[PDB]
Amino acid sequence: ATVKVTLVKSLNGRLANHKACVKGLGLRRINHTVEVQDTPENRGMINKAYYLLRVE
Amino acid sequence: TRNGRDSESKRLGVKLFGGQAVKAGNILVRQRGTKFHAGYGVGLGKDHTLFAKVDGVVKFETKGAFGRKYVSIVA
RNA sequence: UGCUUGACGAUCAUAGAGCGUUGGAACCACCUGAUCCCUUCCCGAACUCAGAAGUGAAACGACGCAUCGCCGAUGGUAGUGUGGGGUCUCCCCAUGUGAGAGUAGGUCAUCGUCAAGCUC
RNA sequence: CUAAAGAGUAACGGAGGAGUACGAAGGUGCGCUCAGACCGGUCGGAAAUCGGUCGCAGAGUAUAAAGGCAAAAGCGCGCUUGACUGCGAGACAGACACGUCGAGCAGGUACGAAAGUAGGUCUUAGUGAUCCGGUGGUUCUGUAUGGAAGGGCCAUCGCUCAACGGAUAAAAGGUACUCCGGGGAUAACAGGCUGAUACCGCCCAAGAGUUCAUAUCGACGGCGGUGUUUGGCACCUCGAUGUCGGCUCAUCACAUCCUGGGGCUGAAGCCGGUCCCAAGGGUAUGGCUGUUCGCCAUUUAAAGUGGUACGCGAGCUGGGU
RNA sequence: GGGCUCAAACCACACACCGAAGCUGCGGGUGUCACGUAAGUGACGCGGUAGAGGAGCGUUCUGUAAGCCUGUGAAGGUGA
RNA sequence: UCGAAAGCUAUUUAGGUAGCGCCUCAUGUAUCACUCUGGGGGGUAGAGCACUGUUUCGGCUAGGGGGUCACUUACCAAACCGAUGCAAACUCCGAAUACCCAGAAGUGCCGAGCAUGGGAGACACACGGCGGGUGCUAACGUCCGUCGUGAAAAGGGAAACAACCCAGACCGCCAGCUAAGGUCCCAAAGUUGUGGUUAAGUGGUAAACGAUGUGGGAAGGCUUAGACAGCUAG
RNA sequence: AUGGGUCAGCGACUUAUAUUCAGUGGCAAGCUUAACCGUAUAGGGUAGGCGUAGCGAAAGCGAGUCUUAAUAGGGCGUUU
Ligand SMILES: [Mg+2]
Ligand SMILES: [Mg+2]
Ligand SMILES: [Mg+2]
Ligand SMILES: [Mg+2]
Ligand SMILES: [Mg+2]
Ligand SMILES: [Mg+2]
Ligand SMILES: [Mg+2]
Ligand SMILES: [Mg+2]
Ligand SMILES: [Mg+2]
Ligand SMILES: [Mg+2]
Ligand SMILES: [Mg+2]
Ligand SMILES: [Mg+2]
Ligand SMILES: [Mg+2]
Ligand SMILES: [Mg+2]
Ligand SMILES: [Mg+2]
Ligand SMILES: [Mg+2]
Ligand SMILES: [Mg+2]
Ligand SMILES: [Mg+2]
Ligand SMILES: [Mg+2]
Ligand SMILES: [Mg+2]
Ligand SMILES: [Mg+2]
Ligand SMILES: [Mg+2]
Ligand SMILES: [Mg+2]
Ligand SMILES: [Mg+2]
Ligand SMILES: [Mg+2]
Ligand SMILES: [Mg+2]
Ligand SMILES: [Mg+2]
Ligand SMILES: [Mg+2]
Ligand SMILES: [Mg+2]
Ligand SMILES: [Mg+2]
Ligand SMILES: [Mg+2]
Ligand SMILES: [Mg+2]
Ligand SMILES: [Mg+2]
Ligand SMILES: [Mg+2]
Ligand SMILES: [Mg+2]
Ligand SMILES: [Mg+2]
Ligand SMILES: [Mg+2]
Ligand SMILES: [Mg+2]
Ligand SMILES: [Mg+2]
Ligand SMILES: [Mg+2]
Ligand SMILES: [Mg+2]
Ligand SMILES: [Mg+2]
Ligand SMILES: [Mg+2]
Ligand SMILES: [Mg+2]
Ligand SMILES: [Mg+2]
Ligand SMILES: [Mg+2]
Ligand SMILES: [Mg+2]
Ligand SMILES: [Mg+2]
Ligand SMILES: [Mg+2]
Ligand SMILES: [Mg+2]
Numbered sequence: 004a005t006v007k008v009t010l011v012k013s014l015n016g017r018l019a020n021h022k023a024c025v026k027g028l029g030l031r032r033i034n035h036t037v038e039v040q041d042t043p044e045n046r047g048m049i050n051k052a053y054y055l056l057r058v059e
Numbered sequence: 060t061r062n063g064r065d066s067e068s069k070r071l072g073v074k075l076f077g078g079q080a081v082k083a084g085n086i087l088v089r090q091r092g093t094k095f096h097a098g099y100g101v102g103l104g105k106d107h108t109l110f111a112k113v114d115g116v117v118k119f120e121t122k123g124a125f126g127r128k129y130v131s132i133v134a
Numbered sequence: 135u136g137c138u139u140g141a142c143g144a145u146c147a148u149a150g151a152g153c154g155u156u157g158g159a160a161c162c163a164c165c166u167g168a169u170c171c172c173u174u175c176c177c178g179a180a181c182u183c184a185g186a187a188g189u190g191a192a193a194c195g196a197c198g199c200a201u202c203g204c205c206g207a208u209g210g211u212a213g214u215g216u217g218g219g220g221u222c223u224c225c226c227c228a229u230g231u232g233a234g235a236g237u238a239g240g241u242c243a244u245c246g247u248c249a250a251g252c253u254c
Numbered sequence: 255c256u257a258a259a260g261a262g263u264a265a266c267g268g269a270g271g272a273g274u275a276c277g278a279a280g281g282u283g284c285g286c287u288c289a290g291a292c293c294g295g296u297c298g299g300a301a302a303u304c305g306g307u308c309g310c311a312g313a314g315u316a317u318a319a320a321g322g323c324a325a326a327a328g329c330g331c332g333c334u335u336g337a338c339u340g341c342g343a344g345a346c347a348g349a350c351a352c353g354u355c356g357a358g359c360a361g362g363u364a365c366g367a368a369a370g371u372a373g374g375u376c377u378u379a380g381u382g383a384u385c386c387g388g389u390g391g392u393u394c395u396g397u398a399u400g401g402a403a404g405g406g407c408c409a410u411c412g413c414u415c416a417a418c419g420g421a422u423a424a425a426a427g428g429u430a431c432u433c434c435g436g437g438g439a440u441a442a443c444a445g446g447c448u449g450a451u452a453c454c455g456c457c458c459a460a461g462a463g464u465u466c467a468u469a470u471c472g473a474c475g476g477c478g479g480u481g482u483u484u485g486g487c488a489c490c491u492c493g494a495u496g497u498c499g500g501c502u503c504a505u506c507a508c509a510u511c512c513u514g515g516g517g518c519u520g521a522a523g524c525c526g527g528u529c530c531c532a533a534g535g536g537u538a539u540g541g542c543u544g545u546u547c548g549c550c551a552u553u554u555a556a557a558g559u560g561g562u563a564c565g566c567g568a569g570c571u572g573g574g575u
Numbered sequence: 576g577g578g579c580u581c582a583a584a585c586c587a588c589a590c591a592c593c594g595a596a597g598c599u600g601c602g603g604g605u606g607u608c609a610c611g612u613a614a615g616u617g618a619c620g621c622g623g624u625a626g627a628g629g630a631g632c633g634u635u636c637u638g639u640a641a642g643c644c645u646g647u648g649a650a651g652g653u654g655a
Numbered sequence: 656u657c658g659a660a661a662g663c664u665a666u667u668u669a670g671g672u673a674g675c676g677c678c679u680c681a682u683g684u685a686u687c688a689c690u691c692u693g694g695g696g697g698g699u700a701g702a703g704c705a706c707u708g709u710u711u712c713g714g715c716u717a718g719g720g721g722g723u724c725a726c727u728u729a730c731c732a733a734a735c736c737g738a739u740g741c742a743a744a745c746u747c748c749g750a751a752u753a754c755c756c757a758g759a760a761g762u763g764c765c766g767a768g769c770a771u772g773g774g775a776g777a778c779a780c781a782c783g784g785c786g787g788g789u790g791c792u793a794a795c796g797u798c799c800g801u802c803g804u805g806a807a808a809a810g811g812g813a814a815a816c817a818a819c820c821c822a823g824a825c826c827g828c829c830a831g832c833u834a835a836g837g838u839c840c841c842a843a844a845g846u847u848g849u850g851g852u853u854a855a856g857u858g859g860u861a862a863a864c865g866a867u868g869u870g871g872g873a874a875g876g877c878u879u880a881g882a883c884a885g886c887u888a889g
Numbered sequence: 890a891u892g893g894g895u896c897a898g899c900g901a902c903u904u905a906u907a908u909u910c911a912g913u914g915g916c917a918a919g920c921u922u923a924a925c926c927g928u929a930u931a932g933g934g935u936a937g938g939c940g941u942a943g944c945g946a947a948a949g950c951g952a953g954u955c956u957u958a959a960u961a962g963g964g965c966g967u968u969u
Contacts, residue, residue: 013597013822013834016803018216023689027762031619033822034598034833037762044760047690053229054217062268065255069378070347071321072260076755077695084344084357088696091377092322095696106377107322108355110345117756119695124146125324128696 004041008049009034009057017055024052077119085111087130095119098131 010030014022027048029037039045049058071089075081088095088109097103098120100113115132122129 011834015821015823018802020689021216023763025689027689029762031764032598040761042691042760044689044691045762048762049690050230051216051690061266062270063266064270066379068262070261071378073696073755074260074346075695076260078693079695079756082344084355086344086346086355089346089355090322091320092327093376094321102355102357104355105374106355108346110356112357117695122146126146 005038006041006045006049007036007059008039009036009059010055011057012055014055017052021052021055024048025055030056075117077117079117080115081111081117081132082114083111087111087117094128095130096127098129100132101130 008028008030010025010033013033014025017025025048028039028045039049049056069089071091073088073095075085075087081087086108087101090107090109093103093107095109097109098118100111100115102110102112104110109130111132113132115134118131118133120129120131121127
């Protein structure tokens with residue numbers, strides 16, 4: 004499938020690998036939405052940084 | 060009577076973990092005694108250094124009648 | 135066809151220990167003797183040699199038994215990564231993870247190569 | 255150990271060791287298995303040597319601890335010198351300099367019948383760069399030439415250079431007679447944070463109080479408050495924030511010394527004790543001492559306790575410091 | 576702080592709204608890549624001390640310059 | 656345009672310097688990060704008592720001490736048995752994380768990686784969270800690990816308030832939506848809605864301990880064979 | 890905490906010689922001169938410097954060389 008992911012919280016002051024999880028999904032700024040393939044590798048980045056994202 | 064002395068850290072321990080490619084001569088374990096024992100293709104140094112005698116991948120195994128942890132090199 | 139015995143392994147206690155029963159045809163052990171090879175900081179005890187009168191007593195092998203040992207869940211609990219919160223020496227919530235102990239229970243192993251005998 | 259299950263990781267953190275030893279305590283082949291307990295046994299006893307059972311590493315391993323140890327890495331015996339020479343794939347460790355491990359090749363050995371094992375010791379401490387000088391080798395160099403000297407190369411010796419990356423071959427103090435450059439990076443004063451300590455209050459109540467815990471006290475313990483003493487820290491100030499005491503002038507708090515109002519009393523009265531309320535006003539003079547204080551004398555209704563840069567030196571003093 | 580008590584407090588739930596230089600909109604500049612052998616388009620960027628890198632302004636003198644400007648007013652000064 | 660450090664090691668060194676770490680530029684070269692899956696070692700949190708120490712009961716029993724002076728125990732106590740606790744320098748056990756390696760998708764602002772070279776700065780750090788030592792689990796204390804912020808970061812919130820919360824400012828706009836935090840007035844936005852609690856201005860500072868404050872819940876005793884309280888009498 | 894009463898003027902990364910790296914030029918297996926000469930920024934002067942070969946302490950050997958008993962391993966070098 005394919006899932007809509009939107010960054011809703013700022014990346015300032017997060018852990019480095021949480022930022023790399025948001026950066027690894029293609030997200031650049033707050034309220035920016037990407038379309039990533041619903042794959043286990045992409046899901047693990049969404050699950051790690053769930054508190055920063057809005058997934059729908 | 061008092062304290063304040065210590066010796067330098069010896070940088071002991073496992074250098075190559077299970078499934079890592081090894082060349083012959085590669086040091087696998089630095090240890091004080093034989094916490095790990097030399098299995099197939101693995102040599103033992105004066106100071107009980109475990110080193111590779113053949114090329115392959117590290118395999119850690121516990122086996123034998125004494126429950127010794129062995130370091131072996133497999134293909 | 136399978137069994138028994140012996141040697142060597144796999145594995146290293148769910149495999150061990152203890153207790154009890156059993157095996158001498160062969161194998162093995164105990165056994166006989168010591169001049170010969172060889173041995174004892176003394177001693178044929180062990181090691182070694184030449185044997186087969188005696189015995190399965192010891193040991194060993196097999197079989198049985200949860201007394202010990204060993205193995206051991208499920209559930210819960212403790213801890214804990216991340217995010218958040220409180221009354222912030224310490225805790226809680228969401229999510230992920232998850233023991234140790236203990237409990238129910240389990241175990242008197244399993245497999246391979248070769249040689250001899252027997253069985254079918 | 256701290257050290258947070260890879261490595262590493264500080265403190266004038268918590269504990270111990272080293273500055274060696276061994277030609278056997280190294281190598282190898284062969285062989286063996288401790289400590290302790292119990293029983294029996296001449297001296298012999300808790301414990302000596304001997305025999306038996308249990309024991310299964312609780313012993314040993316030159317030495318501190320930790321990690322190891324059955325192919326024992328522990329113990330004995332025979333023969334030995336591999337505690338060899340050149341090296342060295344490849345790694346670990348690491349700022350550098352140093353450091354660690356090492357298969358394998360060649361030469362030459364030792365032990366074993368042989369496969370094999372041996373480049374020191376169960377491992378991790380036992381150490382000191384360069385310069386300079388000394389000694390043994392050397393096919394190198396040799397200031398015209400041949401030599402030599404001297405130099406190079408290889409081997410090796412001389413540092414508690416221990417402040418151990420070692421300034422020199424060679425080195426202690428005084429300064430209130432002091433001086434410069436700096437620092438609030440760092441002390442003394444005051445401020446700040448904190449509150450161990452201090453002071454004040456409370457909780458429990460064994461006990462004292464003739465009996466009677468709580469009129470008055472109250473052990474053993476516990477909980478607070480204040481900022482208030484002795485401290486802790488080092489945040490402000492070292493291109494300067496004047497110190498103790500006195501004098502003058504104060505201002506605030508209340509945990510009240512007098513006066514005012516009360517409850518309880520082990521309160522007959524007079525006088526007290528304790529607690530609650532109350533901050534309006536008041537709240538000594540001298541001797542000694544620089545004293546604050548204190549002791550003393552004599553008063554007073556009383557001679558309060560604190561904060562205010564231990565109030566107050568661009569207001570005085572200068573006795574102390 | 577005023578003031579507040581069937582709160583303007585506390586507990587629970589819900590729907591609104593306010594709120595930044597965050598995000599979006601509109602206009603502009605600039606950096607780096609890519610496409611462009613072009614003007615330019617596209618994407619992503621553009622807080623900053625020590626410090627590194629890049630690109631400029633202005634002043635005096637020399638050449639260009641025996642030129643050019645200048646008493647129909649130079650430099651300087653003072654306003655727009 | 657990019658953009659640190661206040662670390663390690665050494666230093667007659669400690670407020671200096673040097674190599675490495677971290678910044679920048681250039682050249683070259685192909686790695687790197689996140690996640691998933693798979694392969695590893697560990698001895699921490701927790702736990703435990705199998706070892707080493709340290710506990711407390713009880714049972715049984717040496718041995719020691721009394722009465723004899725050959726027998727029996729007034730009194731202590733080894734071991735063992737059972738129950739029961741503790742430990743940074745205890746461990747029969749033992750996570751989560753973190754770390755090492757391999758393979759794989761997408762995303763990297765066009766690059767992350769590495770190498771070589773030119774130029775540095777820096778080697779006084781501070782606070783907050785978490786794990787610790789130390790201190791009194793005192794200090795805006797001190798010393799480590801680790802992350803975040805400040806340093807070198809403006810804006811909004813926390814009254815004011817480096818280090819906390821939200822968020823990272825290229826410029827302009829008299830446009831809109833949100834974050835933290837808020838919405839009676841100061842002062843932008845609910846004197847919003849629903850159901851409760853509080854009466855202390857608690858809210859809007861604190862403990863042991865004390866109390867018929869008040870709300871909810873689950874039980875129990877006595878009770879119209881007279882409960883509790885009051886009154887009369889014994 | 891420091892410094893500055895204000896204004897105007899002055900006031901601090903320079904220069905020489907050696908050198909390394911970068912950029913940009915000349916020439917190129919060569920490149921370049923110094924002193925000096927020179928009717929003199931020309932031209933000459935090529936002594937010297939760097940490069941074209943390395944290894945070794947060195948004698949020396951040389952695309953090899955050093956270590957070594959070793960033509961084995963290894964070090965550095967050689968394919969510009
Ligand atoms: Mg015999
Ligand atoms: Mg029998
Ligand atoms: Mg279990
Ligand atoms: Mg379990
Ligand atoms: Mg560690
Ligand atoms: Mg760790
Ligand atoms: Mg005896
Ligand atoms: Mg005895
Ligand atoms: Mg030994
Ligand atoms: Mg001569
Ligand atoms: Mg000589
Ligand atoms: Mg030193
Ligand atoms: Mg004098
Ligand atoms: Mg001075
Ligand atoms: Mg200071
Ligand atoms: Mg002070
Ligand atoms: Mg001050
Ligand atoms: Mg001043
Ligand atoms: Mg009062
Ligand atoms: Mg008064
Ligand atoms: Mg009046
Ligand atoms: Mg007096
Ligand atoms: Mg007088
Ligand atoms: Mg004063
Ligand atoms: Mg004054
Ligand atoms: Mg005066
Ligand atoms: Mg809105
Ligand atoms: Mg706005
Ligand atoms: Mg913006
Ligand atoms: Mg735009
Ligand atoms: Mg920005
Ligand atoms: Mg900028
Ligand atoms: Mg002029
Ligand atoms: Mg930037
Ligand atoms: Mg020195
Ligand atoms: Mg624990
Ligand atoms: Mg990986
Ligand atoms: Mg320093
Ligand atoms: Mg420092
Ligand atoms: Mg620090
Ligand atoms: Mg501090
Ligand atoms: Mg400090
Ligand atoms: Mg600074
Ligand atoms: Mg702010
Ligand atoms: Mg404000
Ligand atoms: Mg309003
Ligand atoms: Mg309303
Ligand atoms: Mg209040
Ligand atoms: Mg009644
Ligand atoms: Mg001044």
